[PDB]
Amino acid sequence: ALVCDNGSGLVKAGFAGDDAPRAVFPSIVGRPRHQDSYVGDEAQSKRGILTLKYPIEHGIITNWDDMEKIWHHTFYNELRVAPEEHPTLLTEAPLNPKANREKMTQIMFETFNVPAMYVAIQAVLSLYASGRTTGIVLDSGDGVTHNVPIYEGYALPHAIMRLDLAGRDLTDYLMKILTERGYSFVTTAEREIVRDIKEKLCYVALDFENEMATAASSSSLEKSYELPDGQVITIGNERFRCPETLFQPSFIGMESAGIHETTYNSIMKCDIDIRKDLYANNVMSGGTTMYPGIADRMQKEITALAPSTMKIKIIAPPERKYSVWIGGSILASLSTFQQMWITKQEYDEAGPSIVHRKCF
C-alpha cells in the first residue's frame, strides 16, 4: 500500500510499512510566462521565473486539476508506481468539506484507478505514530493548525478546533519584522532565506516580556546568520517574536485565541471523564511545532488554565515533521485495518458517498 500525506506546503509520500516517507517535496505547480508546468522540486528550482499555485490551501484541496498533477507526480515521478496496482491511503484535514471527500474518492478510483483506498484524519495518524490511541493533538503545518482530541482511536468531532495561523504566516511575519529592523527581502530567493532563518534560529520564549528585556539590554540572545551571498545579519529578538504569534495571534492582526487557549477549549468540550487522559497526552505534530521551547511554553500555559491538581504532559516527538505520514504507514500496515479499505467493488456499487460510511 501507498501512503500519501498532502499538506498545504509539503507532500509526504511513501510505502506502507516503511519508517519514513521516501518522498518529501513542495506542494506546488509552477507556470512560466506565456511563450508548460512544473511540479514539486522542479518548480521550486525555477520559482523566480514561475508563478506558483498551491493546490492545497489551509489543508483543503482547492485546485483539483493541479492536485491531480501533484498526485500523478507523486505516483509516477516520486514513488515510481502505477496507482492501479496499490491500495492508497490518503490523509485529510480534521475538518474537510463533504464534497471534497467525495471528489478525492472519485478521482482516486476513476482517474487513478486505485484498487482500494482510505482517507484518514492527519492529527489522528500523528497520535498513532506516538504510540497512543487516546490524547489531544496539536497539528500545525504551513497552512493551518488544528486541535484534535481523540479517544480509543477516534477523533471527537464536535471538540475539534481550527486556527488559520500556521507556518507561512510566521514566515511572512518574520520577513515583516526583519524588514522593520532595516533588512530587505523582496525576491523569491530572499523569501526562501527568511524561511530558513525561521527554521534554523527561531525559538519560543518561556516568557515574552522577560525575554524582550534580555534582548534589549544584552547581546546574549543574538545570532549571526550568513546569507548564501556572504551578507551577515544579526537576528535578535526576532528569533522569539516570530513564533510568539502562536500564543498571541494579535501580533499579526488576528483576533483568534492562541494555541494554548484552543487546546484548553478543545479539552473542555470533551466528556469530563476523559479530560485527565487528554491533559496527560498533549502530542505536538507538524513542522510549525518544531520551535525549540514550544513544549515548555505549552506546559506553562496549559498549567495556568487547567485545574491545579491536573497532571499536564506535552509530548513533542523528534520526528513530528513526519508523524502524520508515519501514523499512516502504521495504520495501512495493520492486519485488522484491511477490512477498512474502500475497495473498487465497493466504489463501483456505492459511488463517492461511500467515503462517508467507511472513513471516520
Ligand SMILES: CC1=C(O)[C@@](O)([C@@H]2C[C@H]3OC(=O)[C@H](C)[C@@H]4CCC[C@@]5(CC[C@H](O5)[C@H](O)[C@@]5(C)CC(=O)[C@H](O5)[C@H]5C[C@]6(C)CC[C@](O5)(O6)[C@H]5CC[C@](C)(C[C@@H](C)/C=C(C)/C=C/[C@H]3O2)O5)O4)OCC1
Ligand atoms: C468524518 C469527517 C468529518 O467530520 C468532516 O467532513 C467534517 C464534517 C464537516 O463538519 C462541519 O460542517 C462543521 C465544520 C463541524 C460540524 C460539527 C461541529 C463543528 C466541529 C468544529 C466546530 O463545530 C466549529 O466549527 C468550531 C468551534 C471549530 C473552530 O475552531 C471554530 O468553530 C472555527 C474557527 C474558524 C477559524 C472559522 C470557522 C472554522 O471553525 O475555523 C472552521 C469550520 C469549518 C471551516 C469553515 C473550514 C472548512 C474548510 C471545512 C468545513 C466546512 C468542514 C466541514 C466538515 O468536516 O473552518 O463543526 O471532516 C473530515 C472527516
Ligand SMILES: Nc1ncnc2c1ncn2[C@@H]1O[C@H](COP(=O)(O)OP(=O)(O)OP(=O)(O)O)[C@@H](O)[C@H]1O
Ligand atoms: N525547525 C522548524 N522550526 C519552525 N518551523 C518549521 C521547522 N521545520 C519546518 N517548519 C515549518 O513547518 C511547515 C511545514 O510543516 P508540515 O509539513 O507539517 O506542513 P504541511 O503539512 O505542508 O501544511 P498543513 O499541515 O498546514 O497543510 C513550514 O511552514 C515550515 O517552514
Ligand SMILES: [Ca+2]
Ligand atoms: Ca499537514
Ligand SMILES: [Ca+2]
Ligand atoms: Ca518573478
Ligand SMILES: [Ca+2]
Ligand atoms: Ca489576542
Ligand SMILES: [Ca+2]
Ligand atoms: Ca499543579
